[PDB]
Amino acid sequence: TVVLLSHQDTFTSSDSQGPTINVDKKLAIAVTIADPECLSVTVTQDVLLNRNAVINKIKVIDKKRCSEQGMIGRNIKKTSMMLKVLGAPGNCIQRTYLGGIIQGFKVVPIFIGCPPGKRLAFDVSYT
Amino acid sequence: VIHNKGKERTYFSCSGEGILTGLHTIKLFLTMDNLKVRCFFRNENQSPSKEILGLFTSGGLAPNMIITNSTFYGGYYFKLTPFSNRLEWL
Amino acid sequence: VPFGIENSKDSPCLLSDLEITYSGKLYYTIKLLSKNPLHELKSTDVEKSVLIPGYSSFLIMNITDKWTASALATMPQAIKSNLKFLTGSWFLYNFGTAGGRKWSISTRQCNYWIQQDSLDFMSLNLVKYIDVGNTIDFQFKIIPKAMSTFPIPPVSMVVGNPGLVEVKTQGVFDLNENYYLDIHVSGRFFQKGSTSIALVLWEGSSKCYAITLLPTIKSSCS
Amino acid sequence: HHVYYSYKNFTVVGTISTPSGETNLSSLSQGSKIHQVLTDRIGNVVVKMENNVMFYIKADITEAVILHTWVNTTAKTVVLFDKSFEVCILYYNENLDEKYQLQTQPYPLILELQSINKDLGDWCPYLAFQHNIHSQFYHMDKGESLTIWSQIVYPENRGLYIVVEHYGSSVMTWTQNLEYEIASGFCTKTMITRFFQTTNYELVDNYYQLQKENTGLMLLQFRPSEFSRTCLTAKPVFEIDVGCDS
Amino acid sequence: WRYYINSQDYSIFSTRSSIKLEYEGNSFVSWKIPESCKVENTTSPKTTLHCKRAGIHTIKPIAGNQEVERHLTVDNSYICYLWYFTVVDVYYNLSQIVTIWVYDPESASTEELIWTAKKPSLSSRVLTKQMNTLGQRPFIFTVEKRLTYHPGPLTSEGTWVIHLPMSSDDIAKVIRGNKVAFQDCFIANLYFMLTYPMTIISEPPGYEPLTVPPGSPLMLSWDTCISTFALLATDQETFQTNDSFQTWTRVRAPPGILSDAQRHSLRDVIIFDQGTLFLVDGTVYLRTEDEFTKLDESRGISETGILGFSKRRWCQIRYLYKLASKKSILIAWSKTTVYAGYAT
Amino acid sequence: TVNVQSSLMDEKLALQPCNVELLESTMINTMFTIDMNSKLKLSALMIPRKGENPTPLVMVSNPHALGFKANLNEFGNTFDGNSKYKLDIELKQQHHWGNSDFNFTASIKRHAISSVTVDIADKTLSCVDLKPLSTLISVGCDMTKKI
Amino acid sequence: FYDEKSILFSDSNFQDYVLLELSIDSCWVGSFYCPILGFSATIHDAIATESTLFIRQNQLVYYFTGTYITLFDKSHGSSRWVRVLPSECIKRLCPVYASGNGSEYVLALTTGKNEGYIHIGTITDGLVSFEMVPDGWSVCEKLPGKNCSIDWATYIADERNLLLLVKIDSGQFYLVNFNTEFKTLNILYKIPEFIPEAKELDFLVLLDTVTYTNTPMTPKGLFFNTLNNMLYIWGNFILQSYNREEFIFLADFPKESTIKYMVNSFKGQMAVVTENEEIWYFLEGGYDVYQVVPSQGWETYHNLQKMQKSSFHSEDESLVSLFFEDGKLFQLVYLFDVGKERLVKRLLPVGTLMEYNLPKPFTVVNQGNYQAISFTHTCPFK
Ligand SMILES: *[C@@H]1O[C@H](CO)[C@@H](O[C@@H]2O[C@H](CO)[C@@H](O[C@@H]3O[C@H](CO[C@@H]4O[C@H](CO)[C@@H](O)[C@H](O)[C@@H]4O)[C@@H](O)[C@H](O[C@@H]4O[C@H](CO)[C@@H](O)[C@H](O)[C@@H]4O)[C@@H]3O)[C@H](O)[C@H]2NC(C)=O)[C@H](O)[C@H]1NC(C)=O
Ligand SMILES: *[C@@H]1O[C@H](CO)[C@@H](O[C@@H]2O[C@H](CO)[C@@H](O[C@@H]3O[C@H](CO)[C@@H](O)[C@H](O)[C@@H]3O)[C@H](O)[C@H]2NC(C)=O)[C@H](O)[C@H]1NC(C)=O
Ligand SMILES: *[C@@H]1O[C@H](CO)[C@@H](O[C@@H]2O[C@H](CO)[C@@H](O)[C@H](O)[C@H]2NC(C)=O)[C@H](O)[C@H]1NC(C)=O
Ligand SMILES: *[C@@H]1O[C@H](CO)[C@@H](O)[C@H](O)[C@H]1NC(C)=O
Ligand SMILES: *[C@@H]1O[C@H](CO)[C@@H](O)[C@H](O)[C@H]1NC(C)=O
């Protein structure tokens, strides 16, 4: 879930035409999928104009595709997905004590396969 | 409890009769006898008023005394009484 | 706040162009391009700073001509060339002592709030007793009424005789930059003594009602 | 020669007046007669004289707006909607190539109106009006109810609210619950309206007659308290019919 | 003077859009534009304008005669591209197949802009396959009944192929996509209406024209639910079209049915899917691909008194289809009597 | 039709903005019954203005018959940074609290009525749509009771 | 290192380093078939893979594998530098930054002899084995022209795909793909001569028909990121591609500058070093390259480090190199301080540099009868 706090006068009266304000004209949240055949990314939008807040919930789902029956690290496929705000990278800096941080931009790597730490054991007590 | 929230005004005037200090602050003293104090809500009228007492009593509100120390916390409630005669809380 | 720039009425020099040339010694000579006379520079403007955002700032101090002046420079390494500014590109500020001193230094307003919702922990001075194997846990919240030093925690804490008390501290920031810290205090072994753990808002100014908190931990019979 | 209006269930009836006040649209068109009037779902109305000068009207607004000249006074044109609801102008002329006789060109009505507004200086009293009425037809049986969520955001003390208007058979009941909030120099007034039936049919006599009395169709619209031109919001109108799907 | 934009959708309108300025007049001098906008060939009456900075820009043609100045509002947007679909309907399977691709109005071909195109251009093909490989897929959503239809994989030529039924109950559809932006630009959702195709009347040779009286303004009548199926009656000929007058067909009457002045004296025209109705000198005639009877007292209409007639203006297709008992689709009047015309 | 909220913006009048951002509860919808030796809990949510500090108070129409204990506690803050305060009111019969005098309680055999109101003590004008919360409470028979 | 067979060997991440003279015999293996070039003792194309490290000296390739008990047996470790590929002349040694399939790889590009072929060397459990992947036939056979030369290559551990850019006798460059699992190569792209021209374009999708400026386009190398399947071709330019089919020309990098090398974060950021020793920064979200090091913000940050009296910053310094550590750009630099000259790894906070870039759109707002300079915000969100 990404919360976008907009400026004081980002949205005007012209943005409301239909049942919902056209937020994507001013403030757009975008997702990019590498290898979209076995990943589904769904974005859900909510807007609070009084609080100047945009709540975006991004759900990433595996498509029961890619990889196969393997032993932990042996079947793992590397991929990633991008989430960004259009026009933000390069322009947006989060200024903190000890420096600035690039914002409006993130790449998350995803490994699809048998995760480490799954083990099957023979239960002698119950047996 | 917000410590640096800011307190720019005082609202009550309490007195022990037995002793006191500029009513700006409220300091009390214990002796052998019981600690009995008369207190009144202070608004733009510095004198005791029988309307403010009536309002707070008709809402069912009465003052509380909170006695604190390094290792102590105690609370004493002023008993609800009709404001027909009482000019201030006791 | 942005700060206020010089007005056109006060100084008409801004209604012209600007040329900076490093002079032979260390004075970057200011030159007004427009030869028009309803401009020029009054002598009121000396002990004033010409600046261009993204470049050095020059303190114009010596008036040698109806259209030029002598100034020093802050960060002179950055120049290295003639520089031409156009009208509203360059601005003038007045921080000199001549005609009064506008700038002043003072203390700031309380910028912090300390929240302790637990009863009997609210009082500023408090003494806690620990028996053998017993533990005292408490939590504080700090709300910054302003920017905050986010990478580092806003509270610094010290212990008096750490030899008889072991302290475990956990700190968490949140979305709004509020800072939550939990302190867990335990005794080391069977001995008595007292120690004072002080929690200080190092960033907070001297104007807040409560900056430091001084709990006292006693290993003894309560 | 004139345009007349009736608004809000015939409670506001009158004649459309130009901002100058001359109220006679033929006078502003150099003797031209009104040739065509177009109305769409958004609520904006285009009046085209046979001289090809156009006037703009807005639903529930009693003032017309003359638009800048766009068409040659001698061209033979009509105005029509294209695939989408935008307006286009069709030109017809004899002595063309039999393939170029009918030429359609778009007309940017919203931008022309925006230019006229920037000249005039009107504004919209609210910035956002939101709802969840995504469909125009609502059918339901006895046990079913529907909830309409709407919201309006306006400046801090500009007293505005949402008006719900019904027309037809009042077989249904309403429950309205609103939440009012103030923040950052704006006021948000959320509203939830639930429509349901409260009639019980068990062990009652006259089942079919009562069922007939609780069967019908009604029309509903939600709109802001006050609005003007410069407000692009499309007023939602829908139907609720109680009765079986068949 | 006036101006033109490549895209009819004005959500797309932004700073990157080009505005085609046209001036018609006897004398012209130049174009006066702000510093925020660049015009090409400022001396030519017909030119192009690019306003790279957002705001309200005042444009005026300097000319000998007085000219008005327009304030164009240009706002930067992250909505830049559009959907394009080509539909082919099969009656045997009672369905219809729509091929979809992304196109950019600033760089699309002319036949794409006027929707004549049936294949993606080179630029549109490159854009479509790029937008695919970033992960963007269009889905068609029916507004009246919440039904979603998903495409197949991208075709060798960049297109997504979708199958729909010819429902005739839900005609309003929206083609949508995921939140994938190519180079900081989205694709705008497209609202359309498609249904059973409507066939226009053809013109057999040797037929006679039908016209409005000379000097009378030409009249128009379009279908209530699906526009672009319209009928234009002019002073010279009567035209009918399935699309928004890109292609038209003359509507003409058989010889000997009615007089020459009677042909030139039609006063009102209405269009339906099954046939068209002409009001000629107070009587009413039905034109169909089959036959051209006049409606008379046998059918329930008066003769030589009919002032006019009208149809429904708003598309209430859902309720009327579900109504289970057909009602009137026409109303005519004669200054004394109101006639409620049903189908047939 | 005078719209007082809009009229309370004339520059000549020069009013001050409302100091509370939100004050809401579901208690306003229904009336409540307190039977003998019974109590109930009421809840409200209030959000103040960014800078102002409003003081909420809870009042009862009949203090002789109804006694309340109210607790105001902060629980998280909104996106703008405004703290949200939860107000919990425990309501029961007056004689059971014990702070009342013998003449104040006035017996317990009789039934009575009251109305509890959550309000802002220092609310300004221009607080038109931010009305106080009110609810009617009957200290009397419970109808669903049956033997 | 200029003329010595010395390397910088560092454990940790250049937090500390030792300078070593390698134990190589520095023998001369020049032959009639092998192209003759001046003997220089320097070490080039140093590669350090897990448990093994390769070097190139004057077209000779050596490797040394360390004894890691926790990784494999001690018998695998090597006692002295072992030269690999004796007969061939290797002009360049190319890295593979990913390990696919529990193995490491290194590419060797040959010149003069067997110019059509390339060597791929697999390092598994400290054992190194090389092979010429084109097998029977060379890539020049399938390309137009009399002969060809493979001027750079990358290997994709997944997909078993080998991307290599090939120069033809005519002078044109082709980006070719060879699938190692099969034995089939197909021409992916044909690099255009001359730099495409873009007036008001920030980026340009290289469609078949575009105008061309008259400055020749010289490609130096290419890099492939497998997390997002993104391909970069760099040189006098930068070309970016998502599906190796259509490429996008980034019009912010000037055609006057040439890129020496490219450094990636594998987390969305990339750095570019040119011959002029100026660093450019690229964020994979945007189509923009920013000049970070020669810039106003860097001058501000350097002056601040002077005021704070930082021990890592000096008036005169020389960039040794730069690299990404857990998403942070660390550059190791030699300070020429008088008396206390020293090589040290410093940090380049690019966020701080961007925050201090100072010419920015601003406007003169009005306050209380006074006007002040308010900078115009550019970030779409607060
Ligand atoms: C839109 O606007 C229209 C009108 O502008 C409104 O329609 C109006 O609705 C009214 C009722 O809702 C109609 O008024 C009448 O109301 C009577 C009920 O009121 C009682 O009347 C008796 C008479 O004996 C009195 O003693 C009582 O004290 C009550 O006042 C109805 O009985 C009446 O129905 C018939 O009226 C005819 C008129 O002659 C009688 O002859 C007959 O015996 C019977 O009483 C009628 O309903 C009013 O006529 C009607 N106007 C029109 C033009 O239809 C809509 O309600 C508005 N809609 C909205 C959404 O605002
Ligand atoms: C309704 O009927 C029409 C025509 O009778 C069907 O059109 C044909 O449908 C197939 C289904 O995919 C189309 O795709 C073909 O699929 C095969 C593999 O299944 C593939 O090898 C072909 O190359 C092709 O892709 C086929 O192209 C299409 N025909 C035309 C002329 O477009 C339609 O699918 C039916 N739909 C339903 C919902 O019944
Ligand atoms: C990927 O690496 C594995 C080893 O980790 C290779 O598997 C070996 O391949 C050789 C050559 O065919 C055989 O002699 C061994 O018996 C294999 N060992 C195992 C455990 O399978 C594998 O070949 C490599 N990838 C592919 C597809 O060849
Ligand atoms: C500079 O100022 C000094 C006094 O501070 C003055 O004597 C001198 O004349 C000035 N310079 C010139 C060039 O006039
Ligand atoms: C009870 O109320 C009466 C009425 O004023 C008062 O005089 C009396 O003091 C009260 N008694 C007690 C015990 O509080």
Curated annotation (Swiss-Prot), chain A:
Its subcellular locations are: Cell projection, Cilium, Flagellum membrane
Q: Which cysteines are joined by disulfide bonds?
A: 38-66
Q: In which tissues is it expressed?
A: Testis-specific. Specifically expressed in the principal piece of the sperm tail (at protein level). Expressed in spermatocytes and spermatids within the seminiferous tubule but not in interstitial cells.
Query: According to the lineage, what is the superkingdom?
Result: Eukaryota
Q: Function, please? A: Auxiliary component of the CatSper complex, a complex involved in sperm cell hyperactivation. Sperm cell hyperactivation is needed for sperm motility which is essential late in the preparation of sperm for fertilization.
Quaternary data: Component of the CatSper complex or CatSpermasome composed of the core pore-forming members CATSPER1, CATSPER2, CATSPER3 and CATSPER4 as well as auxiliary members CATSPERB, CATSPERG2, CATSPERD, CATSPERE, CATSPERZ, C2CD6/CATSPERT, SLCO6C1, TMEM249, TMEM262 and EFCAB9. HSPA1 may be an additional auxiliary complex member. The core complex members CATSPER1, CATSPER2, CATSPER3 and CATSPER4 form a heterotetrameric channel.
Q: Family membership, please give it.
A: Belongs to the CATSPERG family.
Q: What else is known?
A: Catsperg2 is absent in sperm from mice lacking Catsper1, suggesting that stable expression requires Catsper1.
Protein name, per record = Cation channel sperm-associated auxiliary subunit gamma 2
Swiss-Prot record, chain B:
Subcellular location per UniProt equals: Cell projection, Cilium, Flagellum membrane
Q: Which residues are glycosylated?
A: 45, 69
User: Where in the chain are disulfide-linked cysteines found?
Assistant: 14-39
Tissue distribution of the protein = Testis-specific. Specifically present in the principal piece of sperm tail (at protein level). Specifically expressed in the seminiferous tubules but not in the interstitial cells. Within the tubules, it is expressed in spermatocytes and spermatids, but not in spermatogonia.
Q: How does it assemble?
A: Component of the CatSper complex or CatSpermasome composed of the core pore-forming members CATSPER1, CATSPER2, CATSPER3 and CATSPER4 as well as auxiliary members CATSPERB, CATSPERG2, CATSPERD, CATSPERE, CATSPERZ, C2CD6/CATSPERT, SLCO6C1, TMEM249, TMEM262 and EFCAB9. HSPA1 may be an additional auxiliary complex member. The core complex members CATSPER1, CATSPER2, CATSPER3 and CATSPER4 form a heterotetrameric channel.
Miscellaneous note, as given in the UniProt record, is: CatSperb is absent in sperm from mice lacking CatSper1, suggesting that stable expression of CatSperb protein requires CatSper1.
What job does this protein perform? Auxiliary component of the CatSper complex, a complex involved in sperm cell hyperactivation. Sperm cell hyperactivation is needed for sperm motility which is essential late in the preparation of sperm for fertilization.
What is the protein's name according to its record? Cation channel sperm-associated auxiliary subunit beta
This chain is encoded by the gene named: Catsperb
Q: Covered range within the whole protein?
A: 22 to 111 of 1109
Swiss-Prot record, chain D:
Write out the GO cellular component annotations. CatSper complex; sperm principal piece
Compartments annotated for it: namely:
Cell projection, Cilium, Flagellum membrane
For whether the record's keyword set contains Metal-binding, the answer is: no
Question: Keywords in UniProt for this one?
Answer: Cell membrane, Cell projection, Cilium, Disulfide bond, Flagellum, Glycoprotein, Membrane, Signal, Transmembrane, Transmembrane helix
The glycosylation sites are: 9, 24, 72
Tissue-wise, where is it found?
Answer: Testis-specific.
Could you tell me the superkingdom of the organism this chain comes from? Eukaryota
Disulphide linkage map? 124-231
Q: Has the keyword S-adenosyl-L-methionine been applied to this entry?
A: no
Provide the family line: Belongs to the CATSPERD family.
Q: How does it assemble?
A: Component of the CatSper complex or CatSpermasome composed of the core pore-forming members CATSPER1, CATSPER2, CATSPER3 and CATSPER4 as well as auxiliary members CATSPERB, CATSPERG2, CATSPERD, CATSPERE, CATSPERZ, C2CD6/CATSPERT, SLCO6C1, TMEM249, TMEM262 and EFCAB9. HSPA1 may be an additional auxiliary complex member. The core complex members CATSPER1, CATSPER2, CATSPER3 and CATSPER4 form a heterotetrameric channel.
UniProt-recorded name of the protein: Cation channel sperm-associated auxiliary subunit epsilon
Species the sequence originates in: Mus musculus
From Swiss-Prot, chain G:
Q: Where in the cell is it found?
A: Cell projection, Cilium, Flagellum membrane
* Family as reported in the entry's similarity comment: Belongs to the CATSPERG family.
Stated role: Auxiliary component of the CatSper complex, a complex involved in sperm cell hyperactivation. Sperm cell hyperactivation is needed for sperm motility which is essential late in the preparation of sperm for fertilization.
What is the source species? Mus musculus (Mouse)
Report where the shown chain sits in the full-length sequence: first residue, last residue, total length: 256 to 637 of 1145
Additional free-text comment from the UniProt record: Catsperg2 is absent in sperm from mice lacking Catsper1, suggesting that stable expression requires Catsper1.
Residues carrying covalently attached carbohydrate according to the record: 101, 147
Return the protein name: Cation channel sperm-associated auxiliary subunit gamma 2
Tissue specificity, in the record's words, reads: Testis-specific. Specifically expressed in the principal piece of the sperm tail (at protein level). Expressed in spermatocytes and spermatids within the seminiferous tubule but not in interstitial cells.
Subunit record text: Component of the CatSper complex or CatSpermasome composed of the core pore-forming members CATSPER1, CATSPER2, CATSPER3 and CATSPER4 as well as auxiliary members CATSPERB, CATSPERG2, CATSPERD, CATSPERE, CATSPERZ, C2CD6/CATSPERT, SLCO6C1, TMEM249, TMEM262 and EFCAB9. HSPA1 may be an additional auxiliary complex member. The core complex members CATSPER1, CATSPER2, CATSPER3 and CATSPER4 form a heterotetrameric channel.
Disulfide bond sites: 34-89, 140-148
